[PDB]
Amino acid sequence: APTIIDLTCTVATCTHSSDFGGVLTLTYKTDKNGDCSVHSHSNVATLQE
Amino acid sequence: RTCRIHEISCGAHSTQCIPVSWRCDGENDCDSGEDEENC
Amino acid sequence: RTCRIHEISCGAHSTQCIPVSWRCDGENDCDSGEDEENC
Ligand SMILES: [Ca+2]
Ligand SMILES: [Ca+2]
Incomplete structure (x- = not known):
């Protein structure tokens, strides 16, 4: 599997x-x-994917 | 060329391996969009 | 080309010296799979 490093999250809208x-x-x-x-x-937020 | 068995190549000048499952799935994944040629 | 006697070169445009033991060892030891060609 791919290795993910330095993950960052930003909300557009x-x-x-x-x-x-x-x-x-x-x-x-x-x-x-x-x-x-x-x-x-x-459970505050529900991903679509 | 000659990438991992799981991943096929999609270029001649460039090195960019992709999983086999990405091949011919209706969306491009390589700059030379040959993942969706000859389906 | 023109690398050490103990090793070969497995590229023309690009330089990559590999030991002779890596030549036709059942694995692609170079970016271009010319180690396992015409064994
Ligand atoms: Ca694709
Ligand atoms: Ca080899």
Whole structure:
């Protein structure tokens, strides 16, 4: 699996509506192209992917 | 060329390996967008 | 090319000296897989 280092999170927009009204972006340094699984560890926010 | 068995190459001048599963999945992943040629 | 006798060169445009033991050892020891060609 790819190795992710220096992960940083910045929120572009945020609207607390019924649908997915927020967008966030992650910047990182990796070593190879691959797939990673994303998760939110609080139920305040629900990822779409 | 001659990358890991899991990953295929998508260039001649450049070195940029991609997983096989990315090949022909309806979205580009290489500058020379040959992941989506000859599906 | 023109590396140490104990080793070979496995590139023309690019220089990369590898020991002779890495020549046809069943693994691609160079960026271009010309170690495992015409064994
Ligand atoms: Ca693709
Ligand atoms: Ca070899």
